[PDB]
Design a binder for this molecule. Structure first.
Ligand SMILES: Nc1ncnc2c1ncn2[C@@H]1O[C@H](COP(=O)(O)OP(=O)(O)OP(=O)(O)O)[C@@H](O)[C@H]1O
Ligand SMILES: [Mg+2]
Lengths: 53, 446, 101
């Protein structure tokens, strides 16, 4: 059952980690967000798009 | 307790008896001396003779000593402790004499028979009569095997203060703290804190405390130093710094100050430290060392520091100096000292960033790195750490390399400040006129 | 002073224009006063014979908890509050009570 809930937790944690990286500054290149987040540019862009709405 | 009418004194009967039993034991009649005595005391017990019971009780204990009947000593110790409740103080004296036996006799079987006396008192037939005797007795077991993981358990099982209350305060503090040193050896740090809090309940017992408490409370300068505590350890060194008022050794006092000022700086900024640094500064005893101006570098001129200059001007605090005693320990080590080198740089970088915030509205990222003495990428990493922790306000527009330290002015704050400007202006006008009357309208009339 | 006039404090008031003019200590009912200054007998423990174990038991809930309270804080028990001295009509009950009195 714990393995069943890992997917949700990864989604939840990914949300928090993005805020922790975007709080420190204002308008910022998406590339640097990927480097600090350690994730590809494609998914990070879309993830931000869903977050903003 | 109960005063029985004086009819016959039983001391004389045993007076001519106990020495007689000695002769029989000396020849080799170890048994015959033994069983005869118990019948002797039993009669006294019915009469409940404190003095009579005590004197006879030790004799059997005393006799077995010289008799070298270790096997018969233990069996004899138990039988004399649970016969008819004995006399409460009667057993008290017996353990005392037996107590001196363990401290003096070497060889392994001491521990084997040592526990026998521990159980005889254990926590039954105990208290003011045989309470404190137990405390030392378990201490001997503590030094029995010099201190190990298992010993720490052998001493924690004794709940000091709460149970051993009716015993000397000065000795209590020793026992309560001694087990703390046992905790550090095993490296159990969570337990060390909790046990530590039980001694600080009372202070100011330094009447004859040349090293009893103040200098023996150094452990907290070791326990607290483990994880991250700097300000807490700083307050401790000052605490012993009152000892120089008591122990004003020239070298000892000098090293303490170097330590007090050393990682007072190390602690991060906080209102608690701000007034602590002021108190440390300004003493009439800090000028004896060059370190005074280092600490003064965190107070005046707002000290936009250059870590390059700080290291080159103060490389003595890592190798040698006037005494450099704390310097070798604080920074001269391999690992523990080295960590405090990075931490100092963080504090020095923290001071530069905070101060530049007060006097800056917008600083380009590139020039920020030069002042901070780190790469631009590193400067962003440190800035983000501070901003995320709600310490310094800063919003960085990395697309243009400009970071501004100004909170977006609110409509009410912009106007509210204008309100406060008028109030001061109105008050000054009132003060200005009132100063004119003191001068223009006073001397003119003359 | 207007700081010792807390709720419940006894206060004397003037007869014509009711106004507090003095704060007073809590009153003692005259019955309670007569309930304390009573005993002239002065009976000693040596007069109540036969009851030896009983006296020791009764003194364990009147004298011991009121002289060495630190003993019972060791074990963790709270000393007993009450005590009922019953028995046949004519044994030592009031004599024992007057003894502690
Ligand atoms: N152990 C004793 N030693 C001396 N006198 C005793 C003893 N027991 C009883 N008495 C006698 O009992 C008499 C009355 O005792 P007390 O009034 O206390 O008993 P009680 O009838 O049980 O009490 P109460 O009715 O008030 O509850 C005393 O005058 C005393 O002489
Ligand atoms: Mg009666």
């Amino acid at each position: 059952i714990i393995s069943t809930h890992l997917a949700k937790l990864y989604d939840n944690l990914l949300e928090q980690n993005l805020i922790r990286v975007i709080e420190p500054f204002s308008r910022v290149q998406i590339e640097h967000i990927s480097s600090l987040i350690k994730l590809s540019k494609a998914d990070v862009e879309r993830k931000l798009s869903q977050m903003i709405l | 307790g109960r005063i029985v009418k004086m009819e016959v004194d039983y001391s004389a009967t045993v007076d001519q008896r106990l020495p007689e039993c000695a002769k029989l034991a000396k020849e080799g009649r170890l048994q015959e001396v033994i069983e005869t005595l118990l019948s002797l005391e039993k009669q006294t017990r019915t009469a409940s003779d404190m003095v009579s019971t005590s004197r006879i009780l030790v004799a059997v204990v005393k006799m077995c000593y010289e008799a070298k009947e270790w096997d018969l000593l233990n069996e004899n110790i138990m039988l004399l402790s649970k016969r008819r409740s004995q006399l409460k103080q009667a057993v008290a004296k017996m353990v005392q004499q037996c107590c001196t036996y363990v401290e003096e006799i070497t060889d392994l079987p001491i521990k084997l028979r040592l526990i026998d006396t521990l159980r005889m008192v254990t926590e039954g037939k105990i208290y003011v009569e045989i309470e404190r005797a137990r405390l030392t007795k378990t201490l001997a077991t503590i030094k029995e095997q010099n201190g190990d993981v298992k010993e720490a358990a052998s001493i924690l099982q004794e709940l000091q203060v709460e149970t051993y209350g009716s015993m000397e305060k000065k000795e209590r503090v020793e026992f309560i703290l001694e087990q703390m040193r046992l905790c550090l050896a095993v490296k159990d740090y969570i337990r060390t804190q909790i046990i530590s809090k039980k001694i600080n309940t009372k202070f100011f017992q330094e009447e004859n405390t040349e090293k009893l408490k103040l200098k023996y409370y150094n452990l907290m300068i070791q326990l607290d130093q483990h994880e991250g505590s700097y300000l807490s350890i700083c307050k401790h060194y000052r605490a012993i710094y009152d000892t120089p008022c008591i122990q004003a050794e020239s070298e000892k006092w000098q090293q303490a100050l170097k330590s007090v000022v050393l990682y007072v700086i190390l602690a991060p900024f906080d209102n608690e430290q701000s007034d602590l640094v002021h108190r440390i500064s300004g003493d009439k005893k800090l000028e004896e060392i060059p370190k005074y101006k280092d600490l003064l570098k965190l107070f005046t001129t707002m000290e936009l520091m250059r870590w390059s200059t700080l290291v080159e001007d103060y490389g003595m605090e890592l190798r040698k100096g006037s005494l450099e005693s704390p310097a070798t320990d604080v920074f001269g080590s391999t690992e523990e000292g080295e960590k405090r080198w990075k931490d100092l740089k963080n504090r020095v970088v923290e001071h530069n960033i905070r101060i530049m915030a007060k006097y800056y509205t917008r600083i380009t990222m590139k020039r920020m790195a030069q002042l901070l003495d780190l790469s631009v990428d590193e400067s962003e990493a440190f800035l983000s750490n501070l901003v995320v922790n709600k310490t310094i306000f800063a919003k960085v527009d990395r697309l243009a390399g400009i970071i501004n330290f100004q909170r977006p002015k609110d409509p009410n704050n912009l106007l509210n400040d204008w309100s406060q400007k008028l109030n001061s202006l109105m008050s000054l006008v009132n003060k200005t006129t009132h100063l004119i009357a003191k001068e223009e309208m006073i001397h003119n009339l003359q | 002073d207007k700081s010792k006039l807390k709720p419940g404090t006894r206060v004397a008031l003037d007869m014509t224009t009711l106004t507090i003019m003095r704060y007073l200590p809590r009153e003692v009912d005259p019955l309670v006063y007569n309930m304390s200054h009573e005993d002239p007998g002065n009976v000693s423990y040596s007069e109540i014979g036969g009851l030896s174990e009983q006296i020791r038991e009764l003194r364990e809930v009147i004298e011991l908890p009121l002289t060495n309270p630190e003993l019972f804080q060791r074990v963790g028990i709270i000393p007993p509050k009450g005590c009922l001295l019953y028995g046949p009509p004519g044994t030592g009950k009031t004599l024992l009570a007057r003894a502690v009195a």
